[PDB]
Amino acid sequence: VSLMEKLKWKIKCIENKFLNYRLTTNETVVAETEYGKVKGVKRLTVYDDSYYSFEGIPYAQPPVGELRFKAPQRPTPWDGVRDCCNHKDKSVQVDFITGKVCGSEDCLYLSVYTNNLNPETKRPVLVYIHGGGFIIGENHRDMYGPDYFIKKDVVLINIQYRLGALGFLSLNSEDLNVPGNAGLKDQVMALRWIKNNCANFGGNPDNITVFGESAGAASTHYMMLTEQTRGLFHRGILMSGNAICPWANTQCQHRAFTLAKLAGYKGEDNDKDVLEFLMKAKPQDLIKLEEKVLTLEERTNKVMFPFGPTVEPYQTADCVLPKHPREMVKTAWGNSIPTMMGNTSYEGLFFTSILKQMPLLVKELETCVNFVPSELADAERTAPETLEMGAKIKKAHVTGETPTADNFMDLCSHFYFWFPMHRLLQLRFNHTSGTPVYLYRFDFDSEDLINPYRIMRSGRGVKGVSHTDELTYFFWNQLAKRMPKESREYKTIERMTGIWTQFATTGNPYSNEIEGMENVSWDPIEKSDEVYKCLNISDELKMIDVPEMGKIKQWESMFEKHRDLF
Numbered sequence: 001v002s003l004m005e006k007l008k009w010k011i012k013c014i015e016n017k018f019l020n021y022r023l024t025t026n027e028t029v030v031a032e033t034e035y036g037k038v039k040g041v042k043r044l045t046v047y048d049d050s051y052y053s054f055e056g057i058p059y060a061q062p063p064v065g066e067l068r069f070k071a072p073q074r075p076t077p078w079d080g081v082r083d084c085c086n087h088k089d090k091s092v093q094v095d096f097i098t099g100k101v102c103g104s105e106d107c108l109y110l111s112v113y114t115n116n117l118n119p120e121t122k123r124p125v126l127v128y129i130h131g132g133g134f135i136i137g138e139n140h141r142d143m144y145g146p147d148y149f150i151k152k153d154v155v156l157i158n159i160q161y162r163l164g165a166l167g168f169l170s171l172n173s174e175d176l177n178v179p180g181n182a183g184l185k186d187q188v189m190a191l192r193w194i195k196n197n198c199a200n201f202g203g204n205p206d207n208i209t210v211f212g213e214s215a216g217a218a219s220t221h222y223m224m225l226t227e228q229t230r231g232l233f234h235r236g237i238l239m240s241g242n243a244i245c246p247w248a249n250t251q252c253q254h255r256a257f258t259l260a261k262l263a264g265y266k267g268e269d270n271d272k273d274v275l276e277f278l279m280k281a282k283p284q285d286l287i288k289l290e291e292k293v294l295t296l297e298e299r300t301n302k303v304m305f306p307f308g309p310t311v312e313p314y315q316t317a318d319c320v321l322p323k324h325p326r327e328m329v330k331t332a333w334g335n336s337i338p339t340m341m342g343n344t345s346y347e348g349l350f351f352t353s354i355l356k357q358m359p360l361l362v363k364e365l366e367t368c369v370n371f372v373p374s375e376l377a378d379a380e381r382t383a384p385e386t387l388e389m390g391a392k393i394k395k396a397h398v399t400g401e402t403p404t405a406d407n408f409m410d411l412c413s414h415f416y417f418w419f420p421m422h423r424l425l426q427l428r429f430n431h432t433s434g435t436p437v438y439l440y441r442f443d444f445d446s447e448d449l450i451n452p453y454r455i456m457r458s459g460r461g462v463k464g465v466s467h468t469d470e471l472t473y474f475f476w477n478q479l480a481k482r483m484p485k486e487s488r489e490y491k492t493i494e495r496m497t498g499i500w501t502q503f504a505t506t507g508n509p510y511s512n513e514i515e516g517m518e519n520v521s522w523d524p525i526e527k528s529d530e531v532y533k534c535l536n537i538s539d540e541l542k543m544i545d546v547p548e549m550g551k552i553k554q555w556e557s558m559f560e561k562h563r564d565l566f
Helices: 001-024 163-170 181-201 215-225 257-264 271-280 283-290 298-300 325-329 348-356 359-366 382-399 405-429 488-506 550-556
Strands: 024-031 037-044 049-059 082-085 109-114 123-129 155-159 202-212 234-240 340-345 437-442 533-537 541-547
Touching: 001 024, 024 049, 109 181, 123 181, 123 215, 123 488, 163 181, 181 202, 181 215, 181 271, 181 359, 202 215, 202 488, 215 234, 215 325, 234 488, 257 271, 325 405, 340 405, 348 359, 348 405, 359 382, 359 405, 382 405, 382 550, 405 550, 488 533
Parallel strands: 037 082, 123 155, 123 202, 202 234, 234 340, 340 437, 437 533
Antiparallel strands: 024 037, 037 049, 049 109, 109 155, 533 541
16 A cells, blocks of 8 residues: 555544544443443534443453453453543554554454434444454444444444454364354354343343345355244345355465465474464464465465365354355355345446456456356366366357456455345245345445545545445444535435344335335345346446346356256
8 A cells, every 4th residue: 555545644643633522521320231330421523423432341251361362251340430531442453554463362352332222212223343364453432433324313332352373273183272253153152142231221132133245244154044043133144245255255274374374383283283383373463474474376276265164063052153154055044034235336446456467367358257156166276177166157258359457346246246146135035934135336426525445445546336345334434524415425424324223123125215226126135036136236226137137147148957956
């Protein structure tokens, strides 16, 4: 990330600290939790609203020392008042602006926000799980401010969970009790705390909506799949992702050794000796070295991250993923709660930044073999069958004689997001009670209001609606400003936060109290449907046939002779 954006960020960081101070009040409040009393503070927003803020609430034991890499444990109770007027630190991770490691191993906290601590009826409880490829992210308000949401009468909760190797290291040896998915198990324990405590903040524990974006969407889906959380919440919103996306799980049991070796480990490849090195190593050193773990073979086959959600190699008491995600959909309790899913209109436009450092990647579309789903392609991607599947991908996205950068980002829309959505819907239909799933497509493009991911994807002065562009209309961030109430940006904030709160309350996302939804008839998808219908959210709200459908079906055709793998 460029020096200019570095300094620009530094200045906004300084600005945001002073704004946070100014927007704080002297009105402190004490709430009960099952672990003891917590002191919150009231804060202001730039739209002159106010909300009660409880930050730094622990839902787990700090996972340091002997707890590193292991499943979370319930926290120790206290008798007194815990100060929850300030944010805790984020999971150890690489800062995408600076490039330096930041955060702490003491990161297992959640935040609770609400405009009214003593409501006259118990309110819908919304739980946000942040994305960031399972390697970055936070529940800090300089990125995920509840300011827009607290206009509505809900209780909003933003959690943290362990990222990267510290969250998702996985070892085969059953004796060492590091099966993997510690970060997902963090998420589970946070949910159990929310189930059992949200009533003290005016939340209705029988009406809980979990939602997330990207890795947060995959997480939300994982929380809908595991037996660990059965009945814990009642609605889910999968924003631009799910658990059968190709980036959303990996078999990383060998990569522990690689990481130890990178960090100075001397000795042999056996799990015990590897684990002991990794347990004494500096958290920052391990996280700094994660970038280098993936081999060139793996990157070529589009493995995105070294460590992440995995099929655990043996079953433990706190086990979250005992089989591959596709196998888990077939027995998922989550299939039978109301669900909303959706994508932006140009998801892959995200990859522009990566495309600029690696022009050669566009030549991959010449045969498209590297984008054939892994389970179908052969090792070297050279089998005649593989070239044939590659060809169906190429016919679907390459528009001219020679492939373009837009052809590439278009393919990425489908490789990373739309095709996995299509596979999940169909698979889910075969194993569900028949609760509704609603589709949206977020199609609203603005450069007047932005979020920090635009800095990462080099999205300055770029048209079209990329992955993460929609977060801007759900959460306050330190790059935001106050928008006039007549502005198309403000209206979208209203529509977006309104639909989500509407879905959270009733399990049905439609309301005629939302501006623009007058002639909207938003039906759930049926298994009988050959064509998906979605609400397309632009300046106007319009029900349309999913535009990506024809390409979606092309991808499906690659499974013609392998319908069992679909």
